Structure formats: C-alpha cells, structure tokens
C-alpha cells in the first residue's frame, strides 16, 4: 500500500528582535546550519550597553545611600522619612538596572531552534523594531523530517488494526515501518516510522492526517516534496 | 516573560514603598503633623501602585498559556519564536475532547416522536431517561465494538426542513473514532 | 571606590556610545542626509561625555590616598 | 456641481499649504538646515497636491457637458 504525502520540516522557528535598534552584524551564512542558542545577529548595543552601565552606577550610589540611612535611623540620627525616600530611590534604581540588563541581553539575537536558516529578510545596517510584524529569518530542523499523509478516516482504522494484529511490521507503539518513494520514482535509501496518532482531521472531508518520520542526514529531503509512503 | 516578570517586580517595589509612605502619613495628619493634602496625595499614590501591581500580576500570569479544556491538541498554528498579540484573530491551537464522542443524527420531526414513544412504551432498549442503547456502523461497513446512548432531547431543528438533530454518545478510548466520519446508529 | 569605580565605567559606556553617534553623523552631514544642526548636537554630546569620563577617572584615582613624602 | 466644486476648493486649499511648506524647505536645504530627504518628502507632497488640484479642476469642468460635434 502506497500513501501519498508531503515532506515538512520537523520543527520551525522564527527569528525576531525584542529590542529596538540597528543591525550591526549578521553572524550567519544564509542557507547554513545553525544551532539553538547561537547568535544570529548583533544589534548595535552601543547605547543599551551605555544605559545599562549608566544605571548600575546609579544603583551603586543610591544603594550606599540607603544602607547608610538604614543604620542611622536605628539610632534616630535620621528620620523615618529620609530613610523611606532613600530606600525608595534604591528600589527604583534596582528596578532600572534589571530592565537595562534585560534590554542589553536582547541585543544578541539568538537562534531559538537548531536547524537550517535560509535567507535573512533583513540587511545589515537596517532598522529593527521590537514588535515589528516581519521576522528577520526562519530556522528549520530538517533532519528527522515529516511526511504528512492523508487517508480517509476509514483507512486509518483499517491500518490501525493490521498494526495490532501483527499484519503490519511494527516500528514502535502505534508505528509501522515504512519506505519512501520520491515523485522522482526513485527509492529513498533510508526508511522510517509512520506514527498512527492523528494530527488533524478535515471534518469537511472527514479525512485524517498522520505523519511519517524519516531520517534525513545529507539533507537529501526537503519540505514541499510530493512523495509516497509504502507499507 | 523576561520583561513582564521585570515590570511586576518593578511594580511591587513601588507599592512596598508608597504603602509605607501612606500608612505613616496616615498617622501624622492624624495629629495634624501633616496637611490633609499631603495624606490624601500619599494614599492616592498608594492606591495607584496597588493597581499597577495587580495589572502587572495579571499580565505575568497570561505569560503561561494554559489549555482551557482536557482533550486532544492537534498541530500548533504558531511556530516557536513567533510574535503573538492579544486580540489576534487566529488561534494558536485547538483542543478536542474526543473520548466520549458525539454522533449527530438527523431524523424528520415525525420519526423523532415515533422513536420517543417506543422508548416510553418499552419497545426500545432503555439506556437512561430519554436515551436508548445504540450500536455504531462505520461507513467502512464494520461494527464499532463498543456501544452507547442515543439521547432524545433535541439539539437543533432546521425549520427550513423541519428535521431535528439529536446526539448519540459513544465511548472512544483508543481514539479509533474521529470527527467527520459518516456513520450509522442502530436500534 | 565601589561607586567612583561604577560612575567611571558608567561614564565610559556613555562616551563609547555618543562617540560612535558623532563619528557616524559627521558622515551623514557630508551627504546632506542630516542637518548640520543634528550633527552639531551629536558632537556636542560627544564632547560632554568625553569631559565626564575625564572627571570620573580623576575621582577614581583619588580613591587611593597615597603618601606625598617618604618618612615616618 | 455642489461637490466637485467643494473638492476643487478643498484641494486648492491643500496645495496652497504644501506649496508654501516646500518653497520654505527649499531655502533650508540650501543652508543645510534640513536633509535632502526632508526637502524630498515636502516637495513630494507638493507635487501630489498640484496633481490633485488639476484632477479636481478637470472634473469640475466636466460638470458642464459639451457637444463633441456640430449637428442635430
Ligand atoms: O527565507 C526563507 C528561506 O530561508 C530562504 O530563502
Ligand atoms: O487544530 C487541528 C489541526 O491540528 C490544525 O489545524
């Protein structure tokens, strides 16, 4: 039995800015392989870095001020007000620093997922805004790769029982071993699982959609291919 | 939540401050050691802080997107790293409780009555008040192993057709039954 | 020196920023892609920063009270 | 023509405005008081207005349908 389907990325993530600024450098090769947590961009941190330190200086000051008054009020050398106001400022500073720190951190646009980044929709030197609609880039885990197969709800059961009645080659709980046949006609050398748990159902058709998972090193398989699973 | 968490704490700091200010100034005006203005203003700020904090708290909370129902989630319409907006048109994902599963049956208003009386006249196998036991037959032809209730209380009526729609309830562990199947209930 | 040290770095951070700003705007003005009033201001900030830094540096330095003479 | 007449004057009002705006920004770029890009946007609007007015004028004129040929 041959089940028609489309290959899809195993995982998709969008790269976006979370701080305002100018793209200083784009540290990645379009179309290369990037790891999750890897810096993909550098937003000119000249200022954020400046504010952050400007802040810490402030906190260092107000903090001393406060700690000194805490001591003094205990001996009434100072009033309950002055200490209150002093500890007030101290708290505000401490807050500012934390916000400064957060923004500086967002200056290094990291990759959320491990996969394959394509073209960078943003040129170096460009202006980037937190909340902006468009994404700077898109990474894609392409190794284990999906193959979305759609069968009429009936067939999914039929297969499901053959799986339990040993009539199908086990591949794991709810998974049968399968082979892939490119629209090329050729036979993808490796083979993978065909999980039976449903992922979606077009109630307007009643048909179900399940996923096959093939190993894809060498990156021979790419999203969008019209293939055929085999049981 | 890096920031929401930051604003929330930034806020709580403030409240802690203004609250002290108030509770104190509430005592000085008490002995005319501070004008009515000074205290009114102090309690003003205090109330504002208290409000700010509550709003910060609410936003932080929404940071963790929970599932409203228990059931089966399908694909996630949103990728990680994506930008999400309150009020946005599209839903991030849809959960569907498929275990007890419904089977919408449509019979002409007449038939519904015919069956309703057989139910009362014991001519139909009771399954509960207003419910008769029923079996399911997939469009496959096969016979769904389990069986369930066929509630007679109407759910909707296409007045343009006069026909009524009632629901059958089948157990569906194993998740063999899925939405959209064209089946047949049997009595 | 906890603070002086902090102000001093707080400062240098600032200068590093305004300095970049200035050096860049001067390029723009040369293409008339920014009013010289914008540049003037940019270089104005740069000079203030540069001044701040120097004063910061001076104060930090005075943080280690040294002995003027050799003796007892 | 109640409206076409209104739109035509509504427009001319606009043009009179943006035109002044432009002519003034034109003296600024001359003294590097503004960027080329600014005088650009200003002159951009000015040209759009001038176009709008001409279209308004044309339409108002057609409010008076005329005969293409001499005949019966
Ligand atoms: O931008 C999406 C792909 O990475 C490239 O073209
Ligand atoms: O929500 C059901 C499917 O997973 C998607 O669209």
CB contact (8 A) between residue A57 and residue C9:
yes
Strand-pairing partners, residue A208, are A151, A201
Phi, psi dihedrals of residue A81, rounded to the nearest 5°: -75, -60
Phi, psi dihedrals of residue B153, rounded to the nearest 5°: -65, 130
- Parallel, antiparallel, or unpaired: how do β-strands B164-170 and B143-151 relate? antiparallel
Write the CA distances from A159 to A12, A169, A210, integer angstroms.
Answer: 29, 11, 12
Question: What length is written for chain C?
Answer: 72
Cα separation, A196 vs A36, whole angstroms: 29
Encoded tokens for A105:
């951190």
What is the CA(B102)–ligand 2 centre distance, in A? 19
For residue B180, which of A152, D51, D40 has the smallest C-alpha distance?
Answer: A152
Q: Which residues of A84-106 are buried (b: 16+ CB within 10 A; e: fewer)?
A: bbbbbbbbbbbbbbbbbbbbbeb
For residue A109, which of A89, A90, A79, A129 has the smallest C-alpha distance?
Answer: A129
| Contact present, A136 and A128 (Cβ < 8 Å) | yes
CB contact (8 A) between residue D33 and residue C35:
yes
Cα separation, D63 vs D40, whole angstroms: 35
| Contact present, A148 and A168 (Cβ < 8 Å) | no
Burial class (CB in 10 A: 0-12, 13-18, 19+), C53: buried
A138 in ligand 1 pocket by Cβ < 6 Å?
yes
Burial class (CB in 10 A: 0-12, 13-18, 19+), C50: middle
Strand-pairing partners, residue A201, are A208
Cα separation, B105 vs D4, whole angstroms: 62
Cα separation, D37 vs A44, whole angstroms: 24
Phi, psi dihedrals of residue D23, rounded to the nearest 5°: -45, -30
Which homologous superfamily is A1-10+142-231 in?
Efflux pump adaptor protein, beta barrel domain (2.40.30.170)
For Cα atoms A81, A84, A88, give the angle at the middle one, nearest 5 degrees: 140
Encoded tokens for B102:
């419904």
Cα separation, B77 vs B86, whole angstroms: 15
CB contact (8 A) between residue A53 and residue C9:
yes
Ligand 1: which of A34, A116, A119, A121 to mutate, most ligand atoms within 8 Å of CB? Answer: A119
Cα separation, D32 vs C37, whole angstroms: 8
Other CB atoms within a 10 A radius of the CB of residue A129 amount to 12
For Cα atoms A150, A155, A160, give the angle at the middle one, nearest 5 degrees: 105
Helix axes D36-61, D2-30, angle to 10 degrees: 160
B60: phi > 0 → left, psi -120 to 50 → alpha, else beta; which?
alpha
CB pairs under 8 A between A and B: 93
| Radius of gyration of chain A, Cα coordinates, nearest whole angstrom | 28
Q: Which distant-in-sequence residues (6+ apart) come within 8 Å of A44 by Cβ?
A: A21, A22, A23, A24, C20
What CATH class does B98-187 carry?
mainly beta
Using the Cβ of A130 and the Cβ atoms of chain C, whether some distance falls under 8 Å is answered with no
DSSP state of A79: -
Encoded tokens for A170:
């086990």
For residue D55, which of D66, D65, D47 has the smallest C-alpha distance?
Answer: D47
Encoded tokens for A119:
């073209």
Place of tokens 């089948």: B170
| Contact present, C21 and C41 (Cβ < 8 Å) | no
A118 in ligand 1 pocket by Cβ < 6 Å?
yes
Query: Where would I find the H helices in chain A?
Result: 46-73, 80-105, 153-164
Q: Which residues of B65-97 are buried (b: 16+ CB within 10 A; e: fewer)?
A: eeeeeeebeeeeebbebeeeeeeeeeeeeeeee
Other CB atoms within a 10 A radius of the CB of residue A58 amount to 22
Encoded tokens for A54:
């400007």
Identify the closest residue of chain A to B138 by CA–CA distance: A154
Identify the closest residue of chain A to B84 by CA–CA distance: A131
What CATH class does D2-61 carry?
mainly alpha
Phi, psi dihedrals of residue A143, rounded to the nearest 5°: -65, -100
CB contact (8 A) between residue A54 and residue C10:
yes
Other CB atoms within a 10 A radius of the CB of residue A37 amount to 10
Cα separation, A181 vs A188, whole angstroms: 6
DSSP string, A185-221: S-EEEEEEEEE-S--EEETTTTEEEEEEEE--GGG--
What is the CA(A209)–ligand 2 centre distance, in A? 10
DSSP state of B165: E
| Contact present, A121 and A134 (Cβ < 8 Å) | yes
Write the CA distances from A195 to A188, A210, B34, B71, integer angstroms.
Answer: 18, 7, 74, 19
Which residues of B are less than 8 Å from A197 in CB distance? 175
CATH of domain A46-105: 1.10.287.470
Specify the ligand 2 atom closest to the Cα of B76: 4
- Parallel, antiparallel, or unpaired: how do β-strands B184-186 and B156-157 relate? unpaired
For Cα atoms C1, C7, C9, give the angle at the middle one, nearest 5 degrees: 100
Q: State which fold the A11-45+106-141 domain adopts.
A: OB fold (Dihydrolipoamide Acetyltransferase, E2P) (2.40.50)
3-state DSSP call for residue B102? strand
| Contact present, B137 and B184 (Cβ < 8 Å) | yes
Specify the ligand 2 atom closest to the Cα of B93: 1
| Contact present, A221 and A1 (Cβ < 8 Å) | no
């Amino acid at each position: 039995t041959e089940l028609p389907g489309r290959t899809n990325a195993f995982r998709i993530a969008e790269v976006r800015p979370q701080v305002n600024g100018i793209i200083l450098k784009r540290l990645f090769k379009e179309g290369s392989d990037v790891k999750a947590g890897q810096q993909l961009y550098q937003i000119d941190p000249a200022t954020y870095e400046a504010d952050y330190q400007s802040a810490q200086a402030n906190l260092a000051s107000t903090q001393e001020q406060a700690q000194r008054y805490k001591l003094l009020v205990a001996d009434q050398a100072v009033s309950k007000q002055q200490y209150a106001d002093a500890n007030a400022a101290y708290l505000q500073s401490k807050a500012a620093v934390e916000q400064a720190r957060i923004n500086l951190r967002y200056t290094k646009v990291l990759s959320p997922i491990s996969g394959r980044i394509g073209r960078s929709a943003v040129t170096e030197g460009a202006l980037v805004t937190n909340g902006q609609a468009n994404a700077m880039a898109t990474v894609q885990q392409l190794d284990p790769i999906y193959v979305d197969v759609t069968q009429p709800s009936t067939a999914l059961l039929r297969l499901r029982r053959e799986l339990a009645s040993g009539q199908l080659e086990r591949a794991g709980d709810n998974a049968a071993k399968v082979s892939l046949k490119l629209e090329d006609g050729s036979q993808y050398p490796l083979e993978g699982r065909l999980e039976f748990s449903e992922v979606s159902v077009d109630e307007g058709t009643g048909s179900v959609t399940i996923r096959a998972v093939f190993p894809n090193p060498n990156n021979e398989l790419l999203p969008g291919m019209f293939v055929h699973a085999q049981l």
